[PDB]
């Protein structure tokens, strides 16, 4: 499995695309990156601990 059980910079959006939009954010739990506008976050709202759907759902 691609994880190697390690935390890496991994673009995993609900979009199931590794594509980069104008804006992306990183999950504090598993390090994965997402388009914030898909996750309900913007560069204005970036929290200290954003949890991703793969972690929080």
């Amino acid at each position: 499995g691609h994880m190697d059980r390690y935390d890496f910079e991994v673009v995993r959006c609900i979009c199931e695309v590794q594509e980069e939009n104008d804006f992306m954010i990183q999950c504090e739990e598993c390090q994965c990156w997402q388009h914030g506008v898909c996750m309900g976050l913007l560069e204005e709202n970036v929290p200290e601990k954003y949890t991703c759907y793969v972690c929080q759902d």
Partner: peptide, 11 residues
């Protein structure tokens, strides 16, 4: 939560 932005190529 780490963050990044882009718009065009690096030229």
């Amino acid at each position: 939560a780490r963050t990044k932005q882009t718009a065009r190529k690096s030229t």
